[model samples]
Every structure is written in C-alpha cells, then in structure tokens.
Target chain A: GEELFTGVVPILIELDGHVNGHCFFVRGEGEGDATIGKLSLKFIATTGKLPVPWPTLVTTLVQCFSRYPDHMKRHDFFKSAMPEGYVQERTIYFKDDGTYKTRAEVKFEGDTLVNRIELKGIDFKEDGNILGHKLEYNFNSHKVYITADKQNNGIKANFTIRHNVEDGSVQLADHYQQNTPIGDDLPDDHYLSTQTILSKDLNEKRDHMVLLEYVTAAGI
Target chain B: GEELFTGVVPILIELDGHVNGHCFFVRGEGEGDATIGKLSLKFIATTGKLPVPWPTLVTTLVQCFSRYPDHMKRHDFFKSAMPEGYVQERTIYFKDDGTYKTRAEVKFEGDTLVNRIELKGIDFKEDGNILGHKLEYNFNSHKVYITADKQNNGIKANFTIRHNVEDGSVQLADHYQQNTPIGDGPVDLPDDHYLSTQTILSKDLNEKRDHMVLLEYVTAAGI
Candidate 1:
C-alpha cells in the first residue's frame, strides 16, 4: 500500500448554473485495480466571492484518475470533454453540517460513494456533473481592463495569472497591468469574454477576446 | 512508502498586494521528515476575473503539515495565527516560460525548496508570505445580495458554500439556505468588503460583519 501519485487537477466547477474556479488535490494509493484515499479540503481563495467544499463530491472521481491514468481507460470516465487519458472514480460523500458526520468512512474500498448527500435546495442531481480537465494552460490573463494605448499599438490593462506547477498554487503572474503575456498564450489567454475556442478555430468568424479568454479559462 | 493521508488545504494567497483564492493538494510520504511530490495544476474557476499559478512557491510548506501535523512543530510553522497544531514546509519553485524548465526536480529528498521563482514585475519579497489555515469554516455565505423580502423579514439573497470535508471539495451548500447559516457564524462569512475581524471582537462598538468574515476566511487562511 504505497503512496502511488499526487494530482493537481484544475477544475472549472459548475453548480446550479453558477461557475467558480476550483481545484482538486487527489492522492491515489493501493495496488492493482482497487485504489482508495481520504479526500479532504486544502484551502480556498475568497469564501465570499469564491466556491466552498462542503458536498463537493466530484462525480468525476479524480483520485484514481490521477494515480492510474492507464487503468482509467476501463472505468466510466468522462466521455468526450477531456483528454485521451482518464478513468472514472466513485466519489465517497458525507454529511458535513452536524459535527462532520461520516456518510462514507475512509477505507481502501470506501472509495465507492455511499450514503450520497441529498442536495436539499442547491441545484445538482444525484449524478449530475462536475466539469474539469487536465492542467493545460500554464498561465492566464486575469482581470484584464480594456483601454487603448497612446499609439494604439495594443491596449494597456494586461496582466497574468501564473499557474505554479510546483505546488499547484495559483497566484498573480508578477504583474498588474504589465502586459506580461499570460501563460505564454499571447493570443489565447488574453482575449475578452467574447472570444471562444471554437469560434477562434475559425478567428476570422465572429470571434472575440474576453469571451474566448473565459471559455478557455473555464476549461469548457 | 505507503500513502498515509491526503489533504485539501484551503488557501487565500496574497501576491503583489493583490489577494486571490487558491488551494493546495499535499501528499506526504516517507513517514518522518524527508518528503516530496510533484506539485502541478488543477482546474480554475474563471481565468479573466481571478488568479493563476505561474510561480506560487508557498513560503510556509503545506504538504508535510497536512500529513504530519504532530511533526510540524519543529521545522518553522506559523508563529501566532494558527490552530495550535503545526509544522513548517519549504516549497520549491519553477520557471514556466519555455516548455517546462526543471528548476525543481521531484525527488524524494526534494521537499526542501530548491530554486525560488522571482517576482519579476509583481510585488513580493524573497521571504514573502502566502497564507492559509486548515479547513475551518464548514460553510460560508457566498455572493450574498442585499434586497429586502416582501415584509423584509431578513433578506432574499442568501446562499452557502458547503465544505465537502469528505473530499476536501468546496461547493454550494445544499443550502437546503433559505438561511443555512454559513459555517456556524452566520455573520462571519457573509459580511461585505468593509468588515474586519478585530472590530467585531467587540462588535457592540465598532463591530462589523463582512470584514471579519474575510479576515476569518483568510485563515488570518494564512499559515
């Protein structure tokens, strides 16, 4: 039962039609086809404006996927939205309101979700969906303001968000309105809320910037 | 070399005076002190309006702290702002420009931070600080809007972000909210951008709500 591998999976979680930037830290262990782990919360950005980890039972079981990418092929992994690599996981859930009740105990076999939480009022189904993709973009243009330069060569209000591959920690890319080219994707990560990955596959068509930046950002 | 425990550490990273929500995924191994793992990227919420992780080298280590809470005391844990339990960790950084440089090799004894990423145009010091606390708040009021109800009994805009302790995932609470208190402190996680934790310790005087909620939210979520 050696620690297999550690995963930093970037996720763009969508719940009740609301989307937030979230991440998953999955540690896989065990031998052969059976794998398990004790999933727990790491930290959050801003509680008010950001997301929280209460009943975040990722339908796309990330633990086994991170450790056993090869074995993921057999399980019920994401159909199309993700990379060629993947395996499905049964997220074990729990009831957190009252003294952190254990709906699912932490056993090697306990990875199979049991005592599933009944999302009382929130907008989610039994096996609804928690969307995510592999860690792709290394940098992203964040909080970009629109304004023309003195000569209009390009605009100002450019900044970047650096994805720290070292610790899976996301921070500002040593910038604040300093056109630093977010993530090396000069044209990709900087667009506005209008551009999209698909529309831009063809940019000559109704493609925009911010929109595409967001579409790319959300990993959707 | 058995995988002991997995951790989902909620982090509120402050870089260049600009603060953003971030998280850490720590997997501890080897049992004692020498530990290491390949830290990589995960999904993000919104790229245009939020943060990124080009060079986030947490000054105070979180990997070892999560697995070996008892052993965290000797290294160099946070001074005064944490739960009483703690151990310190050193983070290795990298350069993410061309392809992927091997600034920090992922070796077993590689936990002791090797190369540090310099804050080129941003604002951060060499021994700067990246803060976060253990998963404390079980629930939090998120994106609360202010609008009176029919009789204005309280308000209509209410919601909660539930902390999935089981998997360390944060999501919107079942709410189940027609006012499902945010974590236990109803007033803590919901306040606006003006409240502070200090002013609320003695709320009768200058006490506020939103401010304290965030202060409490940031762990001080700082290590």
Candidate 2:
C-alpha cells in the first residue's frame, strides 16, 4: 500500500492562454509484469458544440509524439509508425457514442493491444462547483473509467458531454446561433471538455508562467 | 519551522471535464502543522484550439477549526457565488471584456493538489482542399489570469481576447463571433453593441448548453 495511493485519480490545473498542469499517481507494483495499456483519455470542451472528446484527444497525442521522442516506443504500433526508439506497437482511436462509457483503455501484449480499457466512474461528486461561480460547466455527477487488454505501457483518458442542451427545457443564449438542431449527429454541440497528463517536458519558465499567470486565478 | 505560510499560486489541469481512476500522491511529516503551497494544472481538449495546457491553481490555507464540523475548516470566499455539487470551480472574475474573461481562481489548502495526472487529448485534422489551406476559426490567441489574496483563500481569474477576426480573411460558419472591437473602454462602445447571452447559472443548464453549442459551431465553421 503506497502512502499516496488513495485510489488513482486525475487532477487538473488551469493556466493562462490555454496552458495547464496535470498529475496522477502510480500505486504499488502490479501482480505480474508492468501491463502496457492504451490510455484512452476523453473530455468535453463545450457541451453544446463538441460532445465527443476525440478531437482534442488526437491533437494532444500528436503533440506528445512530436515533442517526446521516447513516447513512440511505449505503444504497440510504435514500430509500424516509427521503429526508431519504440519498444512496443500501439494504436489509438475514438468511437462516437461508443462503448467507452466515461473513460476508455487499451491492453497490450508486449507491444500490441490485447484489450482496451473500460471507462469507469472513479470519482463522482454532484454537489460541487468549479472555479467558484463564474463559469458553470455542468457535470452529470462527475464520472471517469478505464479498460485494458494485454499490452499496457502508458495510459490516456478523455471526458465528453452526454446530450445537447437545446433538446431539453434548457434555455438557449442569443449568441448561440447554430442552425443545426440539438442532439443531431452534428459535431458542433458536443460539450465542455478538458485533458490531463502524467508527465510532460516543458521548460521551467513555461511551467512557472502557467501557474503564476493562469492556474492561480482558477480555484481548482 | 514556520507556524503559518500563506500566498496564492496559479493552477491549471492540462485536461478538461470529468476524469475517472485518476490518482494523486501527497506526503508530509510531524504533528505540529503543514500546508500546501501554490500549484497549477493543465490538459488538452481538442485540435482546432492550440495544444496549450489549460491551467488551474489553488490558493488557500487549511487548519483545524473547532468552530466547524470535521474538526477542520477551510472557507472559500471565491466560491461565494456559483451553484454547488458536481461542478468544480474553474476560474474567478477579474474584469469584463465581453467574452466572459471576468476573473477566476481554483484554490486548495492543506490538501495539496494532485500533480502528474494522465488523460486523453482529442484528435482532428486539417482539410485544405475544400476551402484552401486555411483554418476555419482563425482567431488570434487570448488570455485569462487568476488572482490570489495574502492568505491564499481568495482567488479570482479572468480572460481577454487580443484580436477580433471578422474581416472575411477567415470566415466562421456557425456563430462563434469574434470579440467585436466595439470600442476601447466599456463606455466607448454603444449601449447595444455588446453580445448578449443568458447569464451562466447552475440552475440554468439550457443557457449553458446554448452557449456551448453555438460557440463551438461558430468557431469550427469559421463564421
């Protein structure tokens, strides 16, 4: 029982200009080998406009691969994509209204995916507010989950809004002038979203700027 | 060594909205007293927007207050306004520039914020053939900052858009309108020049929904 492991959880910090800090803890050792899993992270950016967390998830992954040379080796498809420093091969994708539920995962067999992570609701709190009372980003009882198969080296997660706000009795804003109906197969009305990371390679100045200039303002 | 240390730190989470199975680790020793300093967090949501991590920070002091329940008490003056439950505070208000950059702050006291969380980033690609090699929501970058008081309990954050993109160079399909340069000061602009949307309230999910849907389409479609 690692002292810090009160159940693995994700925490987020807001920085100015869209920059931010993310953290998570790895508890005691696993029963067998260090299972390699595909971390399918998801989040909602704007509840009405973009319900799926795939768009941002892909972008983050690309940036991670481009910036971190060592990340390529942690997946099952690392050799196929780039066989340079890769010790594993992995593939990542998203399903619209798929079986991921809240969070998603993928298992790896050495370097290949044996099973995907199941999205689970790790932390659920329906009686709290984010950043005091300025912007009301609603959460239907905050939920998160993950699933994996065989190959598991690293993990990624995502969160998405469930429904279109326009469909229900919820009122609409004048500035919100989308011609598409609510809950339609439209990509515009997804939901409020966000992402997190285990570790990153940013400079000290960049990291400081984010906290001093941005995150401090938001009461996380 | 010191009995009390207080200040505010900018914070942010790189990811956005509802995470599960995410874990945090904190360590401290001795029975005298200890507290969390200042921290920031971040996450990436989608592709159209830059991959800049979204930062959230916590500034507040925690201690045993026999006056309150649980034998511990940490009051959030910044949390004075928003509706409660399920919704976690994201930002505080600083000033009003038209695009909801009022101000905000996320605070944590004795409980140090969890750092190094792993989450997912959304995926999207560029398609230049249909419109030519140009982005739909080609708006300039904007900023928002959080403010903390001496004790680190009171935190506030706000936002400001640098440029308003409506010259036709980059067209938006829906109606994510850029900040119309109504005028330099709030008084300089006409009374009706401001864009009007329902106030963001917890009891009112429809209004929030409308804003999110419209804002997303407008930016994506390049209105």
Candidate 3:
C-alpha cells in the first residue's frame, strides 16, 4: 500500500481582504519540502473547540464546493481506508454452536469488510465536556453514536449518525425536548437536544467510483 | 495492499419481539463463505431517497453505540482510509515560476495526507430531488459544500460542512431565512437555509486509534 499524505491544505477564503491562509481540515503526514502539506499550513487549532457564530467561517469556505458535485458519494466506503489497515480481520463465530473462530480478512467472493473505527472527542453537541463517539462501519453505510452523556446538570444529549440506506438521504433530525426553563427554574433550568445524521440510501452499488473521477472533480 | 471486504452486517436491533435481523450500513465486500458482506445484507436501498419522518429510522439504530465510547476521534484521519487508495498521488505547482511538480505521496517527518472525496445524492434536506456534493479533503479536518441551486419552487438551499478548529466542537448551525409569503404571496414567498458542521479540533494527534482500540470500544459500548 502506498503512504497516505496528511497535512493542511491552505484555502483562500475570499482573498478579497484576507492574506494569511485560513486552514480547515488537515489529513495525515505530508510529503516533500512542501513541509506542512503543500500550501505549508503549520497552523493547528489552539483548542478543540470553535468560536460561537460558526456560520461566517463556514460560509466563507463553503463557497468552494457549494456547487455540490457528484464526487461526494465517491467516498461512501472511504475506499482508501481499506488499504491503510482500516479493515480488520477479526474472528466471528459463524456457527452459533461452534466455537471455532477464525480471522476474516477481505472477502473476495463478495465485498465485505469489518470496519471498526474508534471515535472520541467529537463534540457533535459542541457542549463543553462532550463525550466521545463509537462507530462500527459495516458495509457502505456509516453508523456513528457521537454522544451519550449521563445527565449533565439535569440535561442529556444523544447524537447518532447513521446512513438511511433507502430512498434518499437526510442530514439531521434534531429531537431537543425541554420543559421550559423559567417555569421550571431553580436547579431546574435544563436543555436537551438530540442530533442525528440520517444519511440515506447508502447501499446501491455494483460500482462506486474511482480515483480518476475523484481527482477530476477537484479539477486536477 | 490486501483486498477490502464490502458487504452487510446483520444487526439485531431488538429481540423484544422482532427477529428479522435488521440491517444497517454495510461497509465493503465480504470474505470467505460470508457472501454479501458476512451479515449477508442483500437488502439494498431500492431508492436513494428516504421516507418522511427520518427520526424514527435514526433513533431505532442509534441505540447500538449510543453509549458513545472513546474511540471516535480515532478516525479523524479515517486512519484506515489512508490505505484504501483514498489518498492519491497528484502534482501541484510549488512556485509560480517553478512549473516542475513532482508526485508527493506521504510526508514522514510530519503526519499528513491528502484526502479527496466525492459527494452526491446526500439529500441532507429531506425535500427530495437534491443535488450532488463536492469535497477536497486536505488534512485532519473535512470540508464539504453540498448545495448550489438556481431557484426551485421560488426557493433555494445552501448547505456546506467545514470543520472549526478551536477550543471545542460545535455540530450544526442553520441559517434558514424567508421573505414571508403573506402579503408577499404569489411568486414572492421564498425560503433558504444554510446547514454547516462546525466540527472542531480535528488536528490533535501523534498516535490516532489503532485497530485494537476500535474493536475494544465496540465491546465496551456493549455492542
């Protein structure tokens, strides 16, 4: 397997007035004299949180791909993840009565890999001290349980992300319930919201997408 | 690189009275006699769209790992995605006059890799008949721009997802505005909303989660 380059890619967010590059997501170890991933983004987040009004930051850069190209689904399987040892060859007892468990690597007969990804520090709720997440990516769909807190100040947050795998997709369906803070105030002022990603129709594939098509979308 | 298995994993959502083995997201192709990705998930989504109320569907399966373990951040790199050819070797012009661009694969001294993913049919807004998405994943965090429309039913939607690197993580912030279709009725009423993921602190690494930790968390979460 070839080495995957992980570094910051500097994006010019409306260079109309901005000078220094505003960095976003940085992947893995980089390559060459380009140092911090080509555009040389040495800028790392000072903390693990974001400033309040996130819309401005998001809108500034969202302009780049807001056109929503067809390449997004190409990553459904996170195809490249397989080679990097993301897929583990774990043992499962196929036969209920049988105790013989063997390592199941990549299935040649059919496309199936056991994707067990460790998730943590994903503050999906953005609440300070949010719990970590847990994901067991089965096949083409991605399943995530981002938050599961045990009553924080009389409030709870449950955030789960799972592919709908049906007709169409849905991003988030929030279930934030409260009993009115002022009326029930005291130590009773509470807030609870549930955030979930219902990404649908994840399974419909004889062929997903390839590297060539992916790059072209980036205009490579 | 070894081949990747893609198939379905049968999950028994509840045994309280149901026993059909409700299926969820199947990752890759399966291995051995496990045709259809081990769990034998031959059940594919007939349509790429979902039903009306998406909450019930989401909540049903959310119970599995709702305990929310400590391994999620492990995948910030999608650590495994690095191997599956997800990372490509491309050339970029380093200098304005320096037209020589070599293939940069992986950076050793520092941990960095370029992740380029395509997006389409993400119907984030259940309004049906949505558009495709485009992503140019650079480093630790992910960036996505999912919508750009002309004017359908006298309305528009703009959704983009980008990571906010800072003190803590913030999930979704929406900007849905309307011109008010009352006295402004006819073709005057319009609606628009912007959804974005402000996932913060994606770059904190040295040793992301390994295969071992991932599986362990699943068990710990009572999966």
Candidate 4:
C-alpha cells in the first residue's frame, strides 16, 4: 500500500520585451505499477529589459529551464499573475477550524477583479472541505483560470492562450479539470496529468515542453 | 407600426429584523393596447433592529408599503442581501468605440464569484451587441441571476426563491428570457412581460401583485 501525490505545473510568458514564468513539481507514488518520483523545475525571470542582440541562441534557452529550489513547501494556494495594466492586492490565511475561522482577500484593478472569501462555520458547498485556492492571469485578455472548493469537491484549472503577433511568439495550453455537483462523484483515489509549453526565444529553436502527473490513493 | 418601451423593476428583501430593497419604474405605451403606466412603488429599509410585540399585524404590513421616494437613479449596480452572507459588486460602462473599450466588472464574494467582461470594437460574438449587464443573488444557494451578451442576443433574468422558514415568508418567481445564436431571429422590437410578488409583513393581506407588461412592433411591413 503506497499512496502519495502532489502536483503543480505553471508556465507564463510574454515574449520580446521579455517577461517570464515556470514552476513545476511532480511526485507520484506506487501501487500496481505507478512510480514517478520527485521531479522539480523552476525558471522565473524579470530583469531590466535587455536584448540588443543579447542572443547566444538566447542563452541556451535560459539554461535549459533554469533550476533552483531544493526546499519550498508552501501550500494553502493563493496566486496572482499580472502585467497588462497592473494593480494587485493580497491576504490569505487558512486552516483554523475550531469554532469558525477561514480567510481570503484578493483584489485587482485592471480589468477589475476581486476575491473576498470568508467561511466562518460552514455552508460553502460545491463538494465541501477545500479551504483555499485562487488564480488569475490577464496577459492582455488571453485570460486564465484556477479555482478550488470543497465539501462535495471542486477544481477548475484552465488556460488557453495563443499569441504570435508576427514573431513576438507565445502559446500556452493548460488543462486540469474536475467539478462535481449533480449526483456527486469523483473520489476514486484521485489523480491528474498536466501539460505546459513556452517558447519565443528561450531557444532550442525557441520551443519547450513539460508534462507532469500526480496520483493519490487513501485509506488506512 | 407600433413601438413603445420603458423599464425598471427591482425588489430584493429580508424582513422582521429588517433589511432593504426596492426600485420600480414602469411605463409602457401602446400597440396590442399595452397599458401599464406611471405606477411607482418604493420602500427601502435598514435600521437598527427593534421589536416589541412589534406586531400590530406587523405594523399594518409596514404601513401599506411606506411610499417615500420621489427620485433615485443610481447605477453601477452594487447589491447586498445578508442574513448569513452576501456581497456584490458592479461596473458597466458601455458605448465607447475608439480603440476597444466596452466594459463590465462584476463580483460576488459569498463563495467567490467573478465576471470580467471585455468587448473591444465588438467581436465576443454570441448574438452580438449587448454591451453590458450582470446580476447575482446567493440566498444559501437558492442562486438568482441576470446576464446579457449579444451578437444575435441574450438575456436571462431568472430568480426562483422560496423561503417560508416557518412563516417569515418569501416567494420570488421570475422569468424574462431570450437567447439566440444558432440562426438568429428575435428582434421585431422585442417585447417583454415581467412578474412580481413579495412578503415579510409588507402585507397586502401579505399578498400583493404588480404584473408589468411591455410592447413593441416595428415597421417595413412589421418584419
């Protein structure tokens, strides 16, 4: 009986005038032939707009997905992604269910956005039990999504972005889905697979890909 | 050819320990002889919370709908109806075409809700051309609704609220619907009829009615 699972795969980018994004964490355990363990990747950038032929094939596609993060286990999901007219806010606190306590406060004013989540005792149901999660991305209306709710159960991780205004290339595709509320069903030891890709001038001919999968089985 | 149209009907409520909601503007002209005009009703309350026997038949159903507003035309539709929880936000700025500026920002945080609408130089096509609209209500999950978008056209003003809760009483039934996108056809000056009912002690015998109906008929052989 081996059951353990965790997951996260993020890739955000805005090419030519350069901006960056990358986050990957995948861990899958065993049972009847399920073994994919501890694989991590991280490449995040935002530096004084430099590119005057500063291209050695774009520094080997940013050093092949630049990595550095040996220990970082921060949870209780709270996220924010901004760039096209920025204004952001944040406040997150979860895990205190003695009499009544839960929190979330997020506000963004650029294409207006707001999230004020507070659950005192109970009654927030979509499946019920998930305490926190939020995500937003507005790369000039190419939009993005990530939401989580619990008691009955919920998850909506969506992103469909594509832009290539003639060589200022960008393509993002994401999918992680499960939301239940009609005769409820989704708990067969839950597991998921996620995909990501980024390209413009992180060059390997300027293209990339990362696929992550997760598994979870519980009892005893 | 017959064409005449006017609108506004908003009633949101929670009572006894009191809360507020009201907005009524009804004016409909002729054709099929549609007549429902200049009949206004406004009663909004939100005070400290007082009760003695507090029941002279509930103060005569709150003084026969306490008529007291002669002017109120505020927009940016911010709403709130709470017993346990409710929060609403709004932004609708339409009619602007220079370089993509059609707007809508709606937020409801009872359990997280967001509607970020953007229509630039028009092409978010469903039916097309409904610049803006949004509405929300979360009465312990008896969810209410109102949404609009267009290329062909769309609108869903829906509410199915029923809270008796041992005689506190509330029954809201609504339907003003139209959606077209698969072959578009619904605009001969599009007409509508709306319904209403409310109670908390604002009793018309605790039973009241305002049946609003609108009318419109176009030209070029009424097609």
> What is every candidate's C-alpha DockQ against the true complex, given to 2 decimals?
0.14, 0.10, 0.01, 0.02
**Who wins the DockQ comparison?**
1
In candidate 2, residue B75 scores what lDDT? 26
Stretches of model 3 off by over 4 angstroms after superposition: A1-125, A128-220, B1-83, B86-223
lDDT scores of the candidates, listed in order: 0.23, 0.20, 0.18, 0.22
Per-residue CA lDDT of model 1 for A138-204, tens digit only, reads 3343343333333422224332333323336432222222221111111112222212121112332
Error of 1 at B57 (Å): 4.8
| Residue range B159-202, candidate 3, lDDT tens digits | 22221223343222222211111111122211222221121112
TM-score of 2: 0.18
Candidates arranged by lDDT, highest first: 1, 4, 2, 3
Sliding window of 10 residues with minimal summed lDDT for model 2 chain A: A211-220
Model 2 C-alpha lDDT per residue in residues A1-220, reported as the tens digit of each score: 0111122222221111111122211111111111111132222222122222221222221111111123222222212222112121222222221121121221223332221222221121222111111112231221212122223332222333232132342211111111111111111111212232322225422211110000000011
Native-referenced TM-scores of chain A, all candidate models: 0.18, 0.20, 0.16, 0.19
lDDT of 1 at B158: 29
Per-residue lDDT tens digits of candidate 3, residues A71-130?
A: 432311222322322222111111111111111121111221221111111113322111
Q: Comparing 2 and 4 by TM-score, which wins? A: 4
Fnat of each candidate: 0.31, 0.25, 0.00, 0.00
**Root-mean-square deviation of every model:** 25.8, 25.9, 30.7, 22.8
**Could you tell me which 10 consecutive residues in candidate 2 chain B have the lowest summed lDDT?**
B214-223
Report the Cα lDDT for residue B163, model 4: 23
Q: Is the docking of candidate 3 incorrect, acceptable, medium or high quality?
A: incorrect
